[PDB]
């Protein structure tokens, strides 16, 4: 369900700023602000109020010490420990251009050379945010350094400036839940006579100001055993009744999303606690421990195995590993939803359908044949 | 439409050459050509005429100075500044093997260590091309270095050679245009009673020798505010009548490509100038400025907002930023195309269809009922 989300510009809030430093008379404003002061708040010609730093002061060494010497036709450096010291200072400036020469200007994630950890904590501490957002990013520096972009701004008027674009978290501490879907499929000895479907609305769900967000990409989200650290650029909002779909599939308030095919494969899904093993056809599905071998053998159909005592789930030839978190799992002993539908008439080919849409197709085809 | 393009070997013109340096009696020809000459033109045994260089001459130091000393059982180096010079010279060779130890032989993009910027300009200047391709390549080094492959070729006969594969741009200065699509849907209070379709032919379009190319992947193409720097390896050609589809959707000369579904989401598309905001259902779609807040509130249906005075487009909970280029936008006041079709009978499930194909399905289904 990745095509339904809107496409947006990745970093358009940094290129807009970098286009402002280019106009005449602007770079001199920044230089005057950083007069005998490393960090100072400046106001651009755009109208925003950016925060500026003065990392890697290099004029105080070359211009003061090494410049009067090498311009005298009989230069003579005294000792070798001056050369070694100068090589270390110049080393950081070389790494910046090397990393900028292959990315064509835009860098992600920002490396340690670019915005060092000893300064990123000083850049966060003066952001215009609350006292809880700062604590979130202060203890999670390795994550906010993975969602940041740095851009070539200007090298004009004998100064190098590159804009660092840092993320800002607006919504904190709302419950995110995530659901994993498996293709439940009917079992018959004769192949080709089995119909079945699977839900497609898998991903991360959580509230956002009276609504619910939904990220269909299961790989563009982080985990710190309590947080998700995702982004809203690739999310589509939904009405707050989606939670009723999980418990009441046949409710009329909000129809769920399903897809249908007449094929089945014994495929597993590794959840946060255990695996939703689903073996069909003629395969050997097994869950085993690491100290006692085989401890369980599933039958045909959907099945669930917890991670308390199970360390390896094998299906066919593959050998999946199971996560080892700690939480209370539970089982809702219901009945499969597939047995309602008649395998004779069925919309076998669907890619983006719903409970109602599939119901209408069956209702139309079954009623049409009832004429005569 | 990513699956409709053909699949080809990424770097098959370099492995072919690397397989030629291996046969006996060949690497001696290269060594003889580079006798007291860095850059020279050599002809291989394959009939091709490659251009070779002799970067990082290291035998002149170790074999001449450090070799007679360390084989005497009583070695004694004079001063420490000799060691420091040797460490700098030996540093480049270490970095090359480090880059090959994780990529298993093929490296992309070529790093500064492999082919430095001071040399890539000299390598371009002697390529057998015209005087305009050289100018394009010489002023865009950071792009032609991002589309170049390097292959570990041979280390036999006490000499190390790795082939560097550079792009060669053939078609220059033809106008490339790009179209953005949004899922326009009809608006009804009762959910499930609204259909819609959306065009899938989004990507880059521009001419190639009397025809038109088409890159469906919107991410594998660059931008320098005037150029695209795309590649024809993952593009499918089309007849030159595609441009008539934009202005005449219902033309019979060439049918367009659409996809159909009975679901609607409020998703935006960030274009080169403004955003195609399309809010449906019950959501608050808004375009706001950075100095005055809310300045516009859209209604249900497709809408367009320019980037002149608008610096932020918000749909639902997300907050998309808008690019800030400078161009003359335009608005063609037409009428929505979905109002023609009857929502009663409609092929709601499509993934790769056309205007004619959907027309045929309605034409057959509507006429079949009209029997009696």
């Amino acid at each position, epitope marked *: 369900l990745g095509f339904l989300l809107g496409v947006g510009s990745a970093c358009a809030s940094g290129i807009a700023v970098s286009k402002v430093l280019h106009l005449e008379g602007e770079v001199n404003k920044i230089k005057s602000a950083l007069l005998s002061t490393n960090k100072a708040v400046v106001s651009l010609s*755009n109208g925003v109020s950016v925060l500026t730093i003065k990392v890697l002061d290099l004029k105080n060494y070359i211009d003061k010490q090494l410049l009067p010497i090498v311009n005298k036709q009989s230069c003579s450096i005294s000792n070798i420990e001056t050369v070694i010291e100068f090589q270390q200072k110049n080393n950081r400036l070389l790494e910046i251009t090397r990393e900028f020469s292959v990315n064509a200007g835009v860098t992600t994630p920002v490396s340690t050379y670019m915005l060092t950890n000893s300064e990123l904590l000083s850049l966060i501490n003066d952001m215009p945010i609350t006292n809880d957002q700062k604590k979130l990013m202060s203890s999670n520096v390795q994550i906010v350094r993975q969602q940041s972009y740095s851009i070539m701004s200007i090298i004009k008027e004998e100064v190098l400036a590159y804009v660092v674009q840092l993320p800002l978290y607006g919504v904190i501490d709302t419950p995110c839940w995530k659901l994993h879907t498996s293709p439940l499929c009917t079992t018959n000895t004769k192949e080709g006579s089995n119909i079945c479907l699977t839900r497609t609305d898998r991903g991360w769900y959580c509230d956002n100001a009276g609504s619910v967000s939904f990220f269909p990409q299961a790989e563009t989200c982080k985990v710190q055993s309590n947080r998700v650290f995702c982004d809203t650029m690739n999310s589509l909002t939904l009405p707050s009744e989606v939670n009723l779909c999980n418990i009441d599939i046949f409710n009329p308030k909000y129809d769920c999303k399903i897809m249908t095919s007449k094929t089945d494969v014994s495929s597993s899904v590794i959840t946060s606690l255990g695996a939703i093993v689903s073996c069909y056809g003629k395969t050997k599905c097994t869950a085993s421990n690491k100290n006692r071998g085989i401890i369980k053998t599933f039958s045909n159909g959907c099945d669930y195995v917890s991670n308390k005592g199970v360390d390896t789930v094998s299906v066919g030839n593959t050998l999946y590993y199971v996560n080892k978190q700690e939480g209370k799992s539970l089982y809702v002993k219901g009945e499969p939803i597939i047995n309602f539908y008649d395998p004779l008439v069925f919309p076998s080919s669907e890619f983006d359908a719903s409970i109602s849409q599939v119901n209408e197709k069956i209702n139309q085809s079954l009623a049409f044949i009832r004429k005569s | 439409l990513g699956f409709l393009l053909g699949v080809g070997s990424a770097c098959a013109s370099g492995i072919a050459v690397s397989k030629v340096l291996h046969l006996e009696g060949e690497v001696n020809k290269i060594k003889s050509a580079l006798l007291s000459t860095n850059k020279a033109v050599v002809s291989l045994s394959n009939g091709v005429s490659v251009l070779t260089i002799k970067v990082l001459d290291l035998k002149n130091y170790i074999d001449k100075q450090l070799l007679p000393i360390v084989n005497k059982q009583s070695c004694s180096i004079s001063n420490i500044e000799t060691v420091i010079e040797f460490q700098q010279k030996n540093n480049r060779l270490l970095e090359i093997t480090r880059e090959f130890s994780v990529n298993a032989g093929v490296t992309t993009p070529v790093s500064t260590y492999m082919l430095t910027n001071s040399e890539l300009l000299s390598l371009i200047n002697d390529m057998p091309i015209t005087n305009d391709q050289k100018k394009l390549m010489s002023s865009n080094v950071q792009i032609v270095r991002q589309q170049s492959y390097s292959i570990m070729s041979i280390i036999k006969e006490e000499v190390l050679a790795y082939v560097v594969q550079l792009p060669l741009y053939g078609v220059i200065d033809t106008p490339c245009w790009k179209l953005h699509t949004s899922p326009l849907c009809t608006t009804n209070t009762k959910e499930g009673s609204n259909i819609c379709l959306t065009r899938t032919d989004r990507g880059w379009y521009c001419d190639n020798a009397g025809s038109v190319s088409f890159f469906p992947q919107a991410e594998t193409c660059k931008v320098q505010s005037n150029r695209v720097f795309c590649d024809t390896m993952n593009s499918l050609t089309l007849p030159s009548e595609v441009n008539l589809c934009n202005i005449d959707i219902f033309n019979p000369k060439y049918d367009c490509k659409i996809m159909t579904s009975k679901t609607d989401v409020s998703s935006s598309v960030i274009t080169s100038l403004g955003a195609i905001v399309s809010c449906y259902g019950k959501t608050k779609c808004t375009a706001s400025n950075k100095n005055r807040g809310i300045i516009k509130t859209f209604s249900n249906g497709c809408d367009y907002v320019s980037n002149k005075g608008v610096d932020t487009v918000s749909v639902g909970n997300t907050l998309y930023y808008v690019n800030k280029q400078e161009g003359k936008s335009l608005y063609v006041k037409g009428e929505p195309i979905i109002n023609f079709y009857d929502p009663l009978v409609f092929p709601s499930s499509e993934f790769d269809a056309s205007i004619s194909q959907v027309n045929e399905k309605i034409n057959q289904s509507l006429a079949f009922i009209r029997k009696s």
Partner: nanobody
Amino acid sequence: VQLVESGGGVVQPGRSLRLSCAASGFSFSHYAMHWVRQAPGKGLEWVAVISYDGENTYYADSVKGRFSISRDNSKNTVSLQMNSLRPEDTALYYCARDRIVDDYYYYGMDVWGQGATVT
């Protein structure tokens, strides 16, 4: 940084007058231009404003229809055109710049200059 304008003199009511205002220093092709006139000892009042690119113009409601303002980016100059001047236009004009860049909304003035006098 400064900008200079010309066009002084006295003309009988009924004669047109086109006064220019050159600009140097700041990038002229990214800013809007304002015209404001002040009678000697009286208060400032607002006159037409031309946008930075050149398709949007807004004249004062009191004096509209007989005013014309033009902007050129190649010579980075702005020209104001008037016709049928009346005796209460004897004042000191001011060709002043804005303080925001590349916006279609206008926010006050930032840079002024030695204006010209009419009649």
